[PDB]
Symmetry: D2
Subunit: 212 residues, 4 copies
């Protein structure tokens, strides 16, 4: 499993804290983790929570990541942005139970977290704990076993609906503001991490044209 972390500008100062706990859990489970930033450095490439959504969509649809951790001050903004794109099912979580339930009931491929609201003393413990529960069992197993069938059926039906409600992703990439897109993919490690792990040749080709 490949996991990506994405931070926007308001919470960039917490990227090191967040990645430390995410990497700890990933290392133990033998997953691969990629820190796409923001990193909390002066003069670095900037992302808004809206751009977090676009980047999340790019990473997941290309196969460069299997799961994306992101968020913002209260976590709702990033959630809304992520869920504005095809091929993204982005939850919200505040505690470890939330994370386990997201994994088993929804089985999505992204999670948006609050990095300011409720984020104080011991917040990094909460991060470690929720990451552990998020990846405790294989996703989409249902909770409890008695409600597993309707939960999984509903998740499938949702996926089918999303095939109808969203426009083609590459079409979206071509039609959105190109300066907005260029900035979203201007991170110091984007090219290194993305093109090495991208499985979607069509997305790769277009982003290459945007970059050179």
């Amino acid at each position: 499993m490949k996991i990506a972390l994405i931070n926007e500008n308001s919470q960039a100062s917490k990227n090191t804290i967040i990645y430390k706990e995410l990497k700890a859990v990933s290392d133990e489970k033998g997953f691969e983790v990629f820190n796409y930033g923001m990193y909390g450095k002066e003069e670095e490439s900037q992302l808004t929570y809206v751009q977090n959504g676009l980047l999340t969509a790019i990473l997941l649809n290309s196969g460069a990541a299997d799961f994306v951790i992101t968020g913002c001050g209260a976590g709702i903004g990033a959630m809304l942005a992520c869920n504005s794109f095809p091929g993204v099912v982005c939850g919200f979580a505040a505690d470890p139970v939330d994370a386990y339930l997201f994994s088993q009931v929804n089985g999505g491929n992204a999670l948006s977290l609050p990095f300011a609201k409720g984020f104080g003393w011991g917040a990094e413990l909460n991060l470690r704990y929720l990451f552990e529960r998020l990846f405790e069992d294989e996703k989409g197993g249902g909770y409890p076993k008695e409600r597993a069938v309707p939960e999984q059926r509903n998740a499938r039906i949702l996926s089918e609906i999303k095939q109808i409600t969203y426009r083609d992703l590459l079409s979206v990439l071509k039609e959105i503001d190109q300066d907005f897109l260029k900035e979203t993919i201007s991170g110091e490690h984007f090219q290194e991490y993305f093109f090495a792990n991208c499985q979607n040749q069509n997305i790769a080709d277009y982003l290459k044209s945007v970059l050179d």
Copy 2:
């Protein structure tokens, strides 16, 4: 201001509890509440959290409701479904601060709530409290107050993105499974509440054909 309440099957038994608090807050504020069910009534028309999303999209895009309260066991399913349609900005709230921040930071038109996870003693008080905070101040004012401009800008940019990413709702209604759509709008009070409050004649006309006049 017209508020719609929508429950799916697993939490239908809590519809009366939720409605009581939503109605209390709305009456104090002079808002209208339309309870679209489910009602926790034996043999009633059924909704899944996915159908909650579709119904939410129909009510908001048509103008039949200005705000939608919905949810499910943990609240995430309904959030995911609501946000899969154009014209819907659906948050999540576990406490009253969450609801206030949603109103100020995001300024959306729907909120999905957990009706089972964390729902015990005083959960009805939490509902009342969060409904109060949700409608305490004019939406979109920003928090922290100093982050108002970038928050307002980002919410606008989000809308710009959504204009590109979603297909037109009317096309969606024609492309989705029609039995699924018909069930979604088969509630006992749907026709009464919807057609009296709908502001979009194109959506109204299409749904009439789905229901066979």
Copy 3:
């Protein structure tokens, strides 16, 4: 009704934030607030969460305060210390429902709050909200309303038990370390607020001797 606010050293920087919200709620309700610090003032007299407990006991038993708001990083330390003295019933609250339930189920005279754990964006809103719910209804009314009698009975039985389990406060004040006690009452405004509001002359007389008149 007189409310005292007490902060220890680790959360002293948040005293102004907490006071702002407590004062706002108290002003609306017509309550008096006495900020006993710590204030987040360089070189000020220091309190640990243990001393918060002792000060809370002094203020409540003397009648100088009717209710005490205190806390620490996670709120548990101060709770443990407050509840180690007679005449103190100190709850804990993380959200506004917690505060309402404390008022109705326990009907205590102190509340310890987490000022660091979970304390981020909107935490000052949570404070305001919980203070409002804490003083919303007459204390001890019970929740659920049907559990009022056994809750009221159990609270009374708890008091009966405490009459047996604790030593007299005046004896405690004489037996504890006197430097520790003196520091606890060395705040810049302690003498002003305490002696003007104290209703127990025996406690007043003893503390005067500790402070050397």
Copy 4:
């Protein structure tokens, strides 16, 4: 380590749920667990949250248990009762971070939990998680390492204060309402669990006189 579970009447119906998760964590860690009830059975011996406090005090002061898990609807009542007796330091916890912080910052010997407020779907997951974090590290280690010294010093000072503020426990047992005391120790398994694990001969002797 010996862990005891105590439930009062309002939450007795959840004893099986609570004990299942507590036993799971105890079994994994090789601790010993004792279910003192209430068990949620018809016509069983009854406990109020106040009696939970007295029983907690008896178990901890006698050495029959090293740690006590208890609670009530909102958890505050049981906390107040437990902290009304010498030799008991009873925390409160709502989430797993709370439990870890209680262990490291306070290092007490009892924890009171809410079994009704916030106790819904997935509540048993929260119980398992918080029990795991409660016993993750040896108690009183401090959090973070930078605040460990003042935290541990303050916990010691609190213990010293408690030596002064509380009356002698055996004196308390003799002076409280004896019907109240008798009921508190009338549970079906009390004699079996208590006298086998009691290290305080003076408490054992007096309770024997109360029972026969």
